[PDB]
């Protein structure tokens, strides 16, 4: 291959382990769509981690009010009942696979000028979001399993001006 | 890691050294007088 | 030859590459590769046992008071000499089995990975050279710091801030 | 030679008499595995013989539970 | 269409609402797959409902041990932690979409003789299994929301020799 969007400049074609050697064009499409979906999820999840520390919603997710719920991160999954999580998961999945909502003709915008460059920028931002989500999950799990394993506080560290 | 473990691993190292010395002698002498 | 990584490009303030036969250049490359490999191994072998002693995994009285990796010299001399002798015998085998100009090539060729593309091979050579270059300085830094301060690396870090835990 | 149903089921498992791989091959793996096995046997033998003492291991009749 | 497996005898072609009128073959295949999957799920689910009322394993599933603790009814969703349910769903979906495990060379030989008259039997058993849940579920939900709606006990009614 070696001729596809994704090469930036400092590294060029980044295939050190030879993953894309004995494959045809159909498998690289699956690789690319998986990369894009993981990156978009990470891009959403960085903000989804940052924002719930300044304000909350006015809901109640059943008996336990959604505002001032469990502590933001990994501890928040246990508070929500499993049936609601299954509901949200299946709604997400229906929207994803079936295409209900999301795919709106008003969505696909302009696309008049640069197209091969904006996608590359989106991919780079997504990769950075992937790495940020790792650390974030690493910090959350490490501090939740044992309090004070690393001598740091303020969950979203690095940004002390928030919490 | 007691003294017994340290001495055991040291004995393993010494045996490896002896075997290596023997093998080196055999290889060198065999290559010299090929035939 | 294959160095000059974009960070700083080619580096030779002393100009040793001017007055040098091609055989001398090949010898210099081989010496660099060997020193780099040994430096990487030594850095790892200082990092790991000190952490094992710090956690207390290897019982008490592992590396004496001030449990640095250099206490093995004065707590186990016979064993250190045996290790050095084994290494010397193995490298004597390497010397007597290899001709000049190929001293860095172990004829494995069937047990490793060795990526197919030649450009990837050159990139892997550069990566080996770079990690070896880093380890060469790291080893000397570790030796100097331990000899000056007489304390372990992680203990020094926890003593002088830097780290939080 | 009589042919049976079980014979036809198991026929593929006995069809490659004499097939080999040309010249050495996985022999170094065999040698390394044999060396490791020898080291393991020596360790357990010396533990049982009380020539190798390690912490929290007591070679005596145990109260168990 | 009107020529496909599914017709048995008592009624014949059951399409009163005329869903398949302006329909091609691909949507018919999709509908057939949907019916088969829903029916297989119901066939497994009826057994899954009936079995745990008498015997069960000693699984841990986190600190919430399943040894005679989690109820057999639909209330079991909230007893199990949500993350375990998510992992189970993801594994089942991987099997569903990528065919991990499942299809195998020892998968389904036989099939030498009766071929058309086995799929129809599977379909009919699945249809009656789907009618089962509706009542089993409806029964469980009605008896769970507030007991006393129906003058009975013992979830599965009609099998007094169980519990
Ligand atoms: C699950 C995550 C995921 C997936 C599926 C991919 C998949 C892919 N990446 Mg990728 N990547 C990822 C995470 C991921 N990456 C992360 C976290 C980083 C940051 C270190 C990168 C950085 C990266 C670069 C720099 C490049 C790729 C490239 C590629 C493509 C070819 C290389 C390959 O298949 O191996 C392939 C579509 C290459 C490409 O575009 O191929 C043409 C390429 O140049 N990726
Ligand atoms: C019922 C809901 C549902 C359904 C039906 C689908 C369906 C699909 N998704 Mg999907 N997805 C969903 C919810 C759903 N999604 C949610 C909620 C997220 C965000 C968390 C994603 C994120 C996502 C990504 C990033 C990708 C898909 C992809 C796909 C497609 C193929 C992969 C597949 O079937 O899974 C197969 C499942 C696996 C192989 C499992 C992988 C192992 C993981 C790591 C286990 C993680 C378990 C973890 C502990 C629990 C997570 C809880 C919490 C973090 C959410 C398929 C159309 C892929 C795609 O279209 O391109 C190929 C793809 O790249 N999805
Ligand atoms: C009209 C469609 C519909 C219907 C009838 C239900 C029905 C239900 N939902 Mg629900 N849900 C839906 C759509 C729907 N959902 C969508 C689109 C998102 C969610 C997200 C959601 C969450 C997050 C939760 C529910 C819960 C519930 C249950 C109790 C609600 C309560 O008292 O709080 C109930 C079975 C709750 C539950 O799990 O039941 C106890 C719960 O916590 N739902
Ligand atoms: C003894 C170790 C050693 C050796 C033999 C070499 C050898 C080489 N290096 Mg090299 N290098 C080393 C260590 C070494 N390097 C270290 C530690 C670094 C920093 C991490 C670098 C960074 C470096 C760069 C960036 C580049 C090279 C390049 C080269 C090649 C051309 C240079 C030349 O003309 O001769 C080199 C000189 C000699 C062979 C003679 C030995 C030098 C004197 C006699 C030793 C004095 C050391 C002195 C006491 C410093 C002490 C340091 C202190 C911390 C203790 C050559 C093969 C260049 C190359 O080929 O790329 C195209 C290049 O671009 N090297
Ligand atoms: C080149 C780098 C280097 C050097 C010089 C040393 C040196 C040493 N290490 Mg160390 N180490 C290293 C890298 C290195 N290490 C790395 C990379 C790690 C990370 C895994 C470690 C982790 C480590 C631990 C955890 C410990 C040591 C220990 C030791 C000391 C005793 C070790 C010993 O006897 O092993 C014996 C030597 C070997 C196992 C080498 C292999 C021998 C081969 C297999 C023999 C070949 C077979 C034979 C020749 C066959 C003969 C046939 C014939 C024909 C040839 C010694 C000072 C111990 C100590 O107390 O000191 C701190 C200790 O507990 N090391
Ligand atoms: C989710 C459930 C489900 C779904 C998707 C379908 C869907 C379908 N059924 Mg059906 N069916 C169902 C439940 C369902 N049924 C139940 C519960 C019964 C038993 C009462 C039947 C008994 C039934 C018969 C007897 C026949 C169909 C047939 C059909 C197909 C053609 C009729 C049409 O256009 O509509 C259609 C795709 C017909 C078929 O297979 O086409 C030849 C047909 O003859 N159905
Ligand atoms: C739709 C099918 C389905 C679903 C969603 C469940 C779901 C559940 N079963 Mg279950 N079960 C099923 C079919 C099913 N079962 C069948 C067909 C049998 C008979 C073989 C059983 C026998 C059974 C027992 C004996 C027990 C459960 C238990 C459980 C609960 C926790 C264990 C678990 O993750 O599943 C278990 C997963 C399976 C049994 C895998 C079935 C998948 C087939 C083989 C394909 C969970 C609510 C436990 C519980 O909480 O008891 C109250 C328990 O002890 N199940
Ligand atoms: C290597 C893969 C892997 C890893 C790291 C985990 C890790 C975990 N699983 Mg898990 N799981 C796996 C594979 C894996 N799973 C598979 C293949 C099926 C499941 C089904 C499963 C269930 C059903 C549950 C877990 C749970 C858990 C968590 C607690 C486990 C515990 O202490 O007991 C933990 C994060 C539990 C959980 O969510 O903890 C709250 C839980 O209920 N897992
Ligand atoms: C990662 C998870 C995953 C993925 C990717 C798939 C992938 C697929 N499934 Mg599938 N499935 C899964 C898990 C998964 N399955 C599990 C765990 C179950 C059993 C609970 C099923 C049961 C199932 C059936 C019965 C059918 C499929 C079908 C399909 C195919 C198209 C539909 C689709 O992608 O979703 C599309 C998703 C939707 C349209 C969502 C529908 C809305 C749901 C029904 C609302 C439910 C709300 C309720 C409150 C949640 C209950 C949670 C809990 C109590 C069970 C595709 C191959 C269908 C197929 O092959 O033919 C079309 C089909 O008929 N699956
Ligand atoms: C982990 C860590 C940290 C961190 C971090 C990092 C790096 C986090 C990651 C940050 C990063 C890299 C965040 C990128 C965001 C990109 C965005 C928001 C763009 C969205 C743009 C969107 C949603 C576009 C929307 C469009 O609608 C438009 C406008 C037109 C439409 O027609 C079409 C579409 C849909 C395209 C701390 C917390 C900082 C410190 C700590 O110490 C360590």
């Amino acid at each position: 291959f070696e001729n596809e969007p994704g090469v930036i400049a400092p590294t060029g074609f980044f295939d050190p382990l030879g993953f894309t050697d004995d494959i045809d064009q159909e498998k690289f499409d699956q690789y690319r769509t998986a990369e894009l979906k993981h990156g978009r999820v990470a891009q959403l999840a960085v903000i989804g981690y940052i924002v719930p520390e300044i304000f909350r919603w006015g809901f109640d997710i059943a008996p336990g009010v959604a505002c001032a719920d469990v502590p933001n991160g990994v501890a928040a999954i246990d508070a929500i009942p499993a049936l609601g999580w299954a509901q949200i998961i299946f709604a997400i999945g229906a929207v994803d696979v079936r295409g209900w909502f999301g795919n709106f003709d008003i969505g696909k915008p302009d696309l008049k000028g640069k197209d091969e460059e904006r996608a590359l920028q989106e991919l780079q931002h997504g990769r950075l979001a992937m790495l940020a989500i790792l650390e974030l999950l690493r910090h959350d799990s490490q501090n939740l399993v044992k309090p004070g394993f690393d001598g740091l506080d303020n969950l979203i560290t690095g940004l002390p001006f928030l919490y | 890691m007691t003294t017994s473990l340290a001495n055991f691993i040291a004995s393993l190292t010494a045996g490896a050294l002896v075997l290596s010395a023997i093998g080196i002698a055999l290889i060198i002498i065999s290559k010299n007088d090929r035939v | 030859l294959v160095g000059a990584l974009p960070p700083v490009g080619f580096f030779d303030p002393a100009g040793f590459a001017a007055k040098a036969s091609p055989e001398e250049l090949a010898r210099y490359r081989e010496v660099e590769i060997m020193h780099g490999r040994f430096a990487q191994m030594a850095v790892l072998g200082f990092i790991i046992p000190e952490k094992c002693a710090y956690d207390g995994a290897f019982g008490d009285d592992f590396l004496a008071p001030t449990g640095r990796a250099l206490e093995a010299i004065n707590t186990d001399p016979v064993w250190l000499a045996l290790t050095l002798g084994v290494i010397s015998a193995l490298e004597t085998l390497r010397l007597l089995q290899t001709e000049p100009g190929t001293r860095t090539d172990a004829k494995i060729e069937g047990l490793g990975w060795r990526p197919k593309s030649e450009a990837e091979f050159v990139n892997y050579q550069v990566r080996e050279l770079q990690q070896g270059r880093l380890a060469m300085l790291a080893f000397a830094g570790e030796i100097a710091q331990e000899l000056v301060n007489e304390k372990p690396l992680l203990v020094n870090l926890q003593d002088s801030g830097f780290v939080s835990w | 030679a009589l042919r049976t149903r079980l014979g036809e089921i198991l026929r593929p498992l006995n069809a490659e008499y004499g097939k080999v791989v040309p010249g050495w091959g996985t022999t170094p793996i065999m040698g390394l595995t044999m060396v490791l096995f020898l080291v393991f046997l020596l360790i357990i033998l010396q533990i049982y013989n009380s020539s190798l003492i390690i912490e929290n291991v007591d070679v005596d009749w145990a109260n168990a539970i």
Side-chain angles (χ1 to χ4, degrees), chain A residues 1 3 5-7 9-19 21 23 25-59 61-66 68 71-102 104-105 107 109-110 113 115-145 147-162, chain B, chain C residues 1-22 24-165, chain D:
Chain A
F1 274 43
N3 45 358
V7 287
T11 187
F13 193 34
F14 185 46
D15 189 37
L17 278 177
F19 266 74
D21 188 281
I23 55 167
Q25 199 59 252
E26 69 275 16
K27 291 204 55 59
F28 183 78
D29 294 334
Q30 158 204 302
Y31 284 162
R32 176 65 74 205
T33 185
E35 194 178 23
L36 195 59
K37 211 170 284 189
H38 270 71
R40 290 179 180 178
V41 167
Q43 284 195 30
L44 299 186
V46 288
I47 303 300
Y49 292 165
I50 284 184
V51 73
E53 302 279 277
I54 55 168
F55 73 88
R56 306 300 195 79
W57 280 20
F59 249 75
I61 42 171
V65 65
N72 184 25
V74 190
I77 294 93
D78 291 330
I80 304 186
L83 173 60
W85 264 126
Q87 282 161 263
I88 297 151
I89 281 168
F90 273 109
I92 268 152
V95 172
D96 189 21
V97 64
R98 193 43 51 75
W100 286 329
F101 289 159
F104 277 60
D105 45 348
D110 173 83
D115 271 332
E116 278 154 28
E117 194 266 337
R118 315 301 286 284
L120 176 59
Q121 292 179 339
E122 186 171 31
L123 274 181
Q124 299 284 110
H125 274 100
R127 267 80 157 266
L128 194 45
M130 291 177 153
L131 300 180
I133 291 301
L134 283 164
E135 173 81 4
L136 272 177
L137 282 180
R138 179 197 74 83
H139 196 90
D140 285 327
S141 63
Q142 293 301 100
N143 282 132
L144 188 56
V145 167
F149 181 48
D150 44 348
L152 268 186
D153 290 327
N154 290 318
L155 204 90
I156 303 87
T157 203
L159 298 178
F161 63 94
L162 298 167
Chain B
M1 185 86 184
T2 50
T3 61
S4 302
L5 206 49
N7 296 339
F8 175 71
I9 314 293
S11 73
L12 293 176
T13 316
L17 177 56
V18 163
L19 287 180
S20 67
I22 282 172
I24 287 305
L26 283 71
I27 289 173
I28 287 177
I29 301 299
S30 167
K31 275 187 73 69
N32 299 325
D33 186 56
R34 173 83 58 108
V35 65
Chain C
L1 281 71
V2 183
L5 200 71
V8 302
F10 182 76
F11 182 76
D12 193 7
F16 278 132
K19 182 175 73 175
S21 182
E24 278 305 288
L25 295 173
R27 283 186 62 253
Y28 295 170
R29 174 66 89 198
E30 293 189 319
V31 164
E32 202 174 35
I33 291 171
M34 294 299 291
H35 273 54
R37 287 153 167 204
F38 268 114
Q40 301 186 19
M41 294 299 291
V43 164
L44 192 59
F46 281 168
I47 287 294
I48 284 188
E50 287 188 359
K51 181 68 166 62
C52 294
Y54 182 76
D55 286 80
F58 283 45
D60 167 24
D61 189 358
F62 184 24
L63 277 296
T66 61
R68 314 168 278 150
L70 281 169
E71 298 277 350
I73 309 187
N74 43 51
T75 193
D76 275 315
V78 178
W79 183 9
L80 176 58
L82 292 168
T83 304
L84 296 173
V86 168
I87 283 174
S88 73
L90 283 183
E91 201 160 6
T92 310
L93 179 53
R94 179 177 72 87
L95 163 61
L96 66 94
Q97 199 51 37
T98 311
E99 297 85 3
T102 300
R103 306 216 166 283
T104 61
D105 174 27
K107 296 180 182 180
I108 296 168
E109 296 194 358
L111 289 59
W113 195 62
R114 286 180 175 83
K116 280 73 176 175
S117 187
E118 298 296 325
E120 199 65 26
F121 195 66
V122 172
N123 287 320
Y124 265 81
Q125 280 160 285
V126 174
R127 294 181 177 103
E128 189 178 49
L129 276 159
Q130 286 303 108
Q131 304 290 75
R133 285 190 230 272
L134 192 69
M136 185 180 288
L137 301 185
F139 176 62
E142 285 158 3
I143 301 299
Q145 173 183 327
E146 282 184 273
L147 269 175
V148 158
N149 205 5
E150 302 297 321
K151 293 187 286 185
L153 320 175
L154 200 63
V155 167
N156 171 244
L157 259 63
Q158 293 179 356
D159 191 340
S160 298
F162 313 138
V163 75
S164 71
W165 67 80
Chain D
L2 180 62
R3 274 154 73 103
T4 69
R5 267 187 207 75
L6 199 53
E8 313 290 359
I9 291 181
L10 301 185
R11 166 96 278 187
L13 293 171
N14 186 1
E16 293 179 353
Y17 171 74
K19 184 177 180 180
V20 293
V21 160
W24 298 128
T26 47
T27 316
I29 301 299
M30 205 179 61
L32 171 71
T33 313
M34 292 179 49
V35 168
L36 289 173
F37 195 37
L38 176 58
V39 173
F40 168 78
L41 286 176
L42 268 179
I43 284 174
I44 68 176
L45 167 67
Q46 286 198 28
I47 283 182
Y48 192 39
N49 190 254
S50 300
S51 280
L52 189 137
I53 297 90
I54 62 170
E55 182 65 26
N56 288 355
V57 168
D58 195 279
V59 185
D60 191 7
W61 294 95
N63 206 76
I65 297 91

